[PDB]
């Protein structure tokens, strides 16, 4: 179902700017235990950080994983699953700190959440 | 497809090798800008969609235009949108070049008609 | 495992074609840093040279800046990279001012402490050490402007009476494999050069308003000297680490690539046998 | 027998706080393999410097292989290696080169090794 | 058979001077590729030049060719390539243009294309 012509025009972009973020984050990665984050250009500090944010947003609490979440469980519709990925993509929540985005359900939770740890 | 693949194939031959190095430095001598900039380029011209393949005649316009370097002030992003534009400005000489590309197949003779349309119809448009 | 150890070489393949990266642009910055230095040479060799002659010839010593004095309390100036990929280059420097104030100084009160680069303020803010300044981000390639207002802070403290010694250190660029950390006594100066060939200087300005402008002008061309040679020196001692680092790299592809191969045709050989003895088992 | 009920407690640290600096080298060696000591500092450089001196002070020289090399052997009682262990582990022997631990038997030949070499 | 036992003197020489060249010219390509040709030393330009015309004075004009190309073809003895090289590496046509040394057979048709030029 991955094809222009089946979904709508900003799913098939989201989704295509997820994996090229995610895929140019994994080769940059594996060179920063060697080099270290100081030696690296701004383009790939900014890559970094938006993919850390991005890949820690695609978790979830499940209703059936409340014993070993410690949390009650949620539902997430298609609209917003596209909405809250594609704020992260734009760099809407630069300033959201990567420990936001665990566990949580649709992205207004993760600026309530952000108050809440006192930023 | 031999007098414009040879140019195509020494520009991407030296751009797989300085690539997997020189992509992150701020500041280096100007051949080698050039010669990213233009591996940057043609590696957009060879991106295609499904079910869109494309005759020789006009797969041969696109990389004679993009080997010359006529693109060298066209953005990285904006390559795709070029193909479409000259592509549609080449469809009202489809009858001229279609019956001289399809029949001569001499691209050498045909150096200054293409020179000549791709030149002035972008530089008058693009100003 | 020869899943694993693939992984490690992917790693090292990537790694490798970057420090590589880093020894090339390097290369290309070391040659810029010794043409902008010697571009420099015979302004330094003319200013340095007028200077110093009006300062020792046809005079005796009666200012501050030249007379020795009773030392009260002296300050260092130690410049450093902002980076920290630029192997020794920078330990051996702090290592020299380091042991040099804690022979003859065992109190902070008695000296001050003047820092140029990042790994160098975070030596003296680590442990406890005072700091007057701490100039950090300077450009790649700096200009006599840029650490004009530095130097000024610097003479001008020694001028007002607040310092009686001053000492610089840096590095030396000798050759693109060797570079020698080096010190130098900027104040008083107790010593000067002689040409052995005089002429005439004007005598309408004063003798102590004469002096107080020609002593900065000195002090900021030896601090913009140091940091030709520094910077020279910086990307000279980055280009051999980046160098070995490579070398090192490259090497470790191939052992691993040998140890692969050996995995790869065992693997083989095992599979093979099992399924020939289960087949004649059947 | 190494379990705090069998052996003396000074024995027990000592063994104990040996492995742990051994541990550490060896997490530290596949980096320094690249980009060599000059990068590290702090707790990591001061680190290695121990553990060079304890992997030279484990070397010892046999009476069989006086036969091979022109060193008499020697033979090392318990309180004699739980002492120089302890010793180069707190640090009172960090001024000493790691070249003056090689091929000895007690803490004290040590130091009369460097007193040798005179640097 | 590369052994001086085998070969004669001069061979086993020759073929030791032309690969130290060759290997020295290899190590400066990848300066030659980040820095300019004008900055490199004397003996380093003396080596640079020696070693692109030696490159080429190993190329040769085969008669199996002559479909694909005017040029008509060359055999080039043993004694006549060793007597070639050596008058090569002691520089002694070094004021000689590098093309005349491309695509040819023994060291006298070397002179002989340079006076045509």
């Given at each position: 179902?991955?094809?222009?012509?089946?979904?709508?025009?900003?799913?098939?972009?989201?989704?295509?700017?997820?994996?090229?973020?995610?895929?140019?984050?994994?080769?940059?990665?594996?060179?920063?235990?060697?080099?270290?984050?100081?030696?690296?250009?701004?383009?790939?500090?900014?890559?970094?950080?938006?993919?850390?944010?991005?890949?820690?947003?695609?978790?979830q609490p499940f209703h059936?994983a409340e014993?070993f979440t410690g949390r009650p469980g949620k539902?997430?519709?298609?609209?917003?699953?596209?909405?809250?990925?594609?704020?992260?993509?734009?760099?809407?929540?630069?300033?959201?700190?990567?420990?936001?985005?665990y566990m949580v359900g649709?992205?207004?939770?993760?600026?309530?959440?952000?108050?809440?740890?006192?930023? | 497809?031999?007098?414009?693949?040879?140019?195509?194939?020494?520009?991407?031959?030296?751009?797989?090798?300085?690539?997997?190095?020189?992509?992150?430095?701020?500041?280096?001598?100007?051949?080698?800008?050039?010669?990213?900039?233009?591996?940057?380029?043609?590696?957009?011209?060879?991106?295609?969609?499904?079910?869109?393949?494309?005759?020789?005649?006009?797969?041969?316009?696109?990389?004679?235009?993009?080997?010359?370097?006529?693109?060298?002030?066209?953005?990285?992003?904006?390559?795709?949108?070029?193909?479409?534009?000259?592509?549609?400005?080449?469809?009202?000489?489809?009858?001229?070049?279609?019956?001289?590309?399809?029949?001569?197949?001499?691209?050498?003779?045909?150096?200054?008609?293409?020179?000549?349309?791709?030149?002035?119809?972008?530089?008058?448009?693009?100003? | 495992?020869?899943?694993?150890?693939?992984?490690?070489?992917?790693?090292?393949?990537?790694?490798?074609?970057?420090?590589?990266?880093?020894?090339?642009?390097?290369?290309?910055?070391?040659?810029?840093?010794?043409?902008?230095?010697?571009?420099?040479?015979?302004?330094?060799?003319?200013?340095?040279?007028?200077?110093?002659?009006?300062?020792?010839?046809?005079?005796?010593?009666?200012?501050?800046?030249?007379?020795?004095?009773?030392?009260?309390?002296?300050?260092?100036?130690?410049?450093?990279?902002?980076?920290?990929?630029?192997?020794?280059?920078?330990?051996?420097?702090?290592?020299?001012?380091?042991?040099?104030?804690?022979?003859?100084?065992?109190?902070?009160?008695?000296?001050?402490?003047?820092?140029?680069?990042?790994?160098?303020?975070?030596?003296?803010?680590?442990?406890?050490?005072?700091?007057?300044?701490?100039?950090?981000?300077?450009?790649?390639?700096?200009?006599?402007?840029?650490?004009?207002?530095?130097?000024?802070?610097?003479?001008?403290?020694?001028?007002?009476?607040?310092?009686?010694?001053?000492?610089?250190?840096?590095?030396?660029?000798?050759?693109?494999?060797?570079?020698?950390?080096?010190?130098?006594?900027?104040?008083?100066?107790?010593?000067?050069?002689?040409?052995?060939?005089?002429?005439?200087?004007?005598?309408?300005?004063?003798?102590?308003?004469?002096?107080?402008?020609?002593?900065?002008?000195?002090?900021?061309?030896?601090?913009?000297?140091?940091?030709?040679?520094?910077?020279?020196?910086?990307?000279?001692?980055?280009?051999?680490?980046?160098?070995?680092?490579?070398?090192?790299?490259?090497?470790?592809?191939?052992?691993?690539?040998?140890?692969?191969?050996?995995?790869?045709?065992?693997?083989?050989?095992?599979?093979?046998?099992?399924?020939?003895?289960?087949?004649?088992?059947?």
């Amino acid at each position: 179902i991955m094809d222009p012509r089946i979904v709508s025009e900003e799913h098939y972009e989201v989704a295509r700017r997820v994996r090229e973020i995610l895929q140019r984050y994994k080769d940059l990665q594996d060179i920063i235990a060697i080099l270290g984050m100081e030696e690296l250009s701004e383009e790939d500090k900014l890559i970094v950080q938006r993919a850390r944010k991005i890949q820690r947003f695609l978790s979830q609490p499940f209703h059936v994983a409340e014993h070993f979440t410690g949390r009650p469980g949620k539902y997430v519709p298609i609209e917003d699953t596209i909405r809250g990925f594609k704020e992260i993509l734009d760099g809407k929540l630069d300033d959201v700190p990567e420990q936001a985005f665990y566990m949580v359900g649709t992205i207004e939770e993760a600026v309530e959440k952000a108050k809440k740890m006192k930023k | 497809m031999k007098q414009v693949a040879g140019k195509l194939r020494l520009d991407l031959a030296q751009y797989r090798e300085l690539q997997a190095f020189a992509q992150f430095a701020s500041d280096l001598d100007e051949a080698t800008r050039a010669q990213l900039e233009r591996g940057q380029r043609m590696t957009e011209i060879l991106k295609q969609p499904q079910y869109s393949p494309m005759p020789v005649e006009k797969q041969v316009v696109i990389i004679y235009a993009g080997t010359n370097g006529y693109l060298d002030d066209i953005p990285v992003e904006k390559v795709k949108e070029f193909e479409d534009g000259f592509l549609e400005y080449i469809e009202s000489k489809h009858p001229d070049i279609l019956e001289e590309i399809r029949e001569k197949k001499a691209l050498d003779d045909e150096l200054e008609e293409k020179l000549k349309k791709a030149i002035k119809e972008f530089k008058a448009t693009f100003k | 495992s020869l899943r694993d150890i693939k992984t490690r070489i992917n790693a090292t393949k990537k790694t490798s074609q970057i420090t590589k990266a880093m020894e090339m642009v390097s290369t290309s910055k070391l040659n810029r840093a010794e043409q902008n230095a010697k571009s420099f040479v015979p302004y330094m060799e003319k200013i340095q040279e007028v200077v110093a002659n009006v300062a020792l010839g046809a005079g005796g010593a009666s200012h501050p800046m030249l007379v020795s004095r009773p030392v009260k309390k002296t300050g260092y100036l130690v410049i450093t990279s902002d980076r920290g990929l630029a192997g020794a280059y920078n330990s051996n420097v702090l290592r020299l001012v380091y042991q040099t104030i804690q022979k003859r100084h065992a109190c902070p009160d008695e000296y001050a402490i003047i820092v140029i680069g990042r790994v160098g303020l975070s030596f003296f803010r680590k442990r406890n050490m005072p700091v007057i300044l701490d100039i950090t981000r300077l450009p790649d390639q700096p200009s006599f402007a840029d650490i004009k207002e530095i130097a000024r802070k610097t003479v001008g403290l020694f001028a007002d009476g607040t310092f009686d010694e001053l000492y610089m250190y840096y590095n030396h660029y000798v050759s693109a494999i060797q570079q020698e950390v080096t010190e130098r006594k900027l104040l008083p100066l107790t010593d000067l050069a002689e040409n052995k060939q005089r002429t005439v200087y004007e005598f309408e300005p004063s003798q102590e308003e004469c002096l107080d402008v020609l002593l900065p002008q000195y002090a900021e061309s030896l601090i913009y000297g140091a940091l030709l040679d520094a910077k020279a020196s910086e990307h000279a001692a980055r280009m051999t680490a980046m160098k070995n680092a490579t070398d090192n790299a490259n090497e470790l592809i191939r052992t691993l690539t040998l140890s692969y191969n050996r995995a790869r045709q065992a693997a083989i050989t095992q599979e093979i046998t099992e399924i020939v003895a289960g087949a004649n088992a059947l």
